[PDB]
Amino acid sequence: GVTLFVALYDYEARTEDDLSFHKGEKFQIVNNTEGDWWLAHSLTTGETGYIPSNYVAPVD
């Protein structure tokens, strides 16, 4: 199946294409073949945008 990710820390977006998120928010990753910033889809807001991959961990 799929592997979801959870935010380890809060993050405030500083560009048009990044997401702001809170610790504990969950994501489905859309693309992670593009560097350490991953295109992700928030399960809270339904938005898609970049997140810093070191701010999340795989959900067990």
Burial of 48 (0-12, 13-18, 19+ CB in 10 A): middle
Enclosing domain of residue 15: 1-60
The experimental technique behind this entry is X-ray
Q: Count how many domains the chain has.
A: 1
In angstroms, the CA 34 to CA 22 distance is: 23
Rounded CA separation 27/59 (Å): 10
Distance separating the N- and C-terminal Cα atoms of the chain: 12
